[PDB]
């Protein structure tokens, strides 16, 4: 007999998949450059979106891993002896204050958990629990968000996961140092309900199920024509 | 004590992570019905298979219907296709196919159910035939008779179930490998025709469903080929 361990929900949805690649400067530039932001959602990576949308209701934790790689930037007045660099990684749960620029007061709020990671170590990790009001995240929602039967159709429901922000703690007088962030996302303790048929049409919106009418399968030569795509050889001369 | 390989990030590691939000009491789980424990629970359910995709029906419902008509057709073939899920254009789009494409090694047997969606007073016979991997397909009804066959009487019985077995030298066969004349063919032939009483339709339609038996296992998870697009949406 053959085992079915490889097809279970855990082993099917617990692969760490990169969801965001961002870059941000250190000293010089407009305020929007100096920090990197991302709202946690699973509707923008097409592969992960398809695998999650295979079901309707889901319930899981979140493990997030950050691979931050820094580098120097060409220009004028280059530093020769910066000791190290440190990064602040901030999680903003729904209902929390949000920074609008670097060096804002919101970076010191005591309600937002933060990680101070100094480069050279192992990449930083965190594990966010099931943060929601309802009893399960619902991928597909049919209805309107406001009881007056008008609003955004089937969106911005009571499911949210928060935002995540990264900033350079080290104020740098001379030179500009760029950094690149890669965010790896993995669900843990997944529970899934109400299976669905996998999608067919190409994905077109990060919030809608809008689509183009596509065919149901691939064309074939004839109704009763078997493949026979083997060239001339020792067999079938 | 510690090797330099101790300080690394391996993307397929399963270690506990520090909790960002301790002392947070999560919402208790309720009993939403219909929980699934294993994706093999999904491939064991029947799906309608588009056997009639002759390049003009893929953009219509007509792809699902196999046409059967009564007349001077003595031994003309109703339909025929190669039994290779995961890659064959007949099967690769159904539930079974789109579960298999997520995996790289597959094992077990398959089940086909033909349903005669015709009138209640139409009589005839049909000769379903199965050819093993090590054989060429039949070309005359007599050839398909002398192999493995089942005779379906559409007057007595309205549905037929045919179970295609697992024959292979090795345990797991690759999903994406085209085995020319090594997968097996299924063909159906007229035996008597179609007989109808006066005032009744002279044509019918034979739907087909394909599903998995209890015997599958799958191995080596990978990425599907169907999602050609890769960019971050919007």
């Amino acid at each position, epitope marked *: 007999y053959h085992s079915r361990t490889e097809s279970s929900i855990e082993n099917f949805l617990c692969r760490a998949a990169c969801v965001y690649i961002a870059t941000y400067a250190s000293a010089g530039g407009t305020p929007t450059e100096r920090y990197a932001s991302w709202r946690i959602n699973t509707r923008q990576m097409v592969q992960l979106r398809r695998k999650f949308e295979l079901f309707t209701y889901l319930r899981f934790d979140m493990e997030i891993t950050f691979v931050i790689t820094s580098t120097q930037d060409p220009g004028t007045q280059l530093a020769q002896d910066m000791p190290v660099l440190t990064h602040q990684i901030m999680y903003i749960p729904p209902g929390g204050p949000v920074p609008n620029s670097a060096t804002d007061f919101a970076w010191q709020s005591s309600t937002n958990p933060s990680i101070f990671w100094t480069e050279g170590c192992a990449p930083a990790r965190m594990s966010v629990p099931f943060i929601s009001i309802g009893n399960a995240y619902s991928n597909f929602y049919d209805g309107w968000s406001h009881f007056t039967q008008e609003g955004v159709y089937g969106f911005n429901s009571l499911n949210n996961m928060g935002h995540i922000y990264v900033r350079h703690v080290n104020e740098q007088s001379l030179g500009v140092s760029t950094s690149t962030l890669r965010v790896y996302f993995k669900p843990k303790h997944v529970r899934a309900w109400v299976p669905r048929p996998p999608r067919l049409s190409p994905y077109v919106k990060s919030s809608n199920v809008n689509f183009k009418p596509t065919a149901v399968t691939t064309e074939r030569k004839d109704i009763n024509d078997v493949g026979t795509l083997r*060239p*001339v*050889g020792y067999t079938n*001369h | 004590m510690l090797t330099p390989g101790s300080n690394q990030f391996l993307t397929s590691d399963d270690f506990q992570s520090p909790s960002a939000m301790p002392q947070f009491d999560v919402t208790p789980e309720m009993k939403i019905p219909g929980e699934v424990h294993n994706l093999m629970e999904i491939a064991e359910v029947d799906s309608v298979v588009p056997v009639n995709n002759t390049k003009e029906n893929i953009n219509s419902m007509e792809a699902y219907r196999i046409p059967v008509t009564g007349g001077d057709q003595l031994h003309t073939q109703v339909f025929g296709f190669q039994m290779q899920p995961g890659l064959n254009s007949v099967f690769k789009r159904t539930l079974l196919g789109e579960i298999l494409n997520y995996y790289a090694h597959w094992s077990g047997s398959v089940k086909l159910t033909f349903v005669f969606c015709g009138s209640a007073m139409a009589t005839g016979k049909f000769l379903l035939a199965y050819s093993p991997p090590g054989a060429s397909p039949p070309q005359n009804r007599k050839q398909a008779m002398l192999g493995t066959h089942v005779i379906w009487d559409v007057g007595l019985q309205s549905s037929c179930v045919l179970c295609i077995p697992w024959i292979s030298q090795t345990h797991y066969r690759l999903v994406q490998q085209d085995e020319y004349t090594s997968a097996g063919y299924v063909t159906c032939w007229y035996q008597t025709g179609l007989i109808v009483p006066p005032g009744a339709p002279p044509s019918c339609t034979i739907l087909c469903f394909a599903s998995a038996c209890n015997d599958f296992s799958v191995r080596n998870l990978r990425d599907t080929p169907f999602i050609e697009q890769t960019q971050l949406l919007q």
Partner: antibody
Amino acid sequence: EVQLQQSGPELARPWASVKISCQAFYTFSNYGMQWVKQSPGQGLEWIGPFYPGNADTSYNQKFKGKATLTADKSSSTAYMQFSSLTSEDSAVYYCARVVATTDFDYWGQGTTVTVSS
Amino acid sequence: YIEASQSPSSLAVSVGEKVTMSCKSSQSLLYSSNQKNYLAWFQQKPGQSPKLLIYWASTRESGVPDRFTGSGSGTDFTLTISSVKAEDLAVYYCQQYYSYPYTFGGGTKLKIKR
């Protein structure tokens, strides 16, 4: 670089069967013999292959039911039979031979099969 | 029926100029097991026996000069002559040996420009 011969160019007649032999200077081991026809225009068209050492017979659908193949490996002479010949069959009938499974290296000399109505 | 399509026009160029010709074998000619292309180019001296020049779509033939170079994969295939010659008059064909039937190309004569 081995040369290749045949029966020869002969002036035939309508409904007069033309036997074009093809001489052999090789073995009969899993290699093949075939013909093509050199018409005034559009180059060459295949007529039918025969594989000695495999007992395989095949015909082009443009000649199906109209041409037949007979071969004699021992005598080194193999026939290409035909009947009901028309006046539009006049072409240089080249005999090609292949020591391979899928190749077309060698070529023949040619025969002129023009007739006179 | 597998179809091949030659270039609509012949060379129509002077002697000694680099020339590029192409054959479009519609049905795919790449074999999974061997990664081989079953397409060979042919030259036909008018009245003499034609012979192929580049076979396997990657190999120059024995006894064939270094000027003829044929490449390509998939449905399309292309051939280049580094310098055309006047005494090499022929009608260039492309023949596929993937599957029956054996179909020739469309032809390309070495016409006169002088």
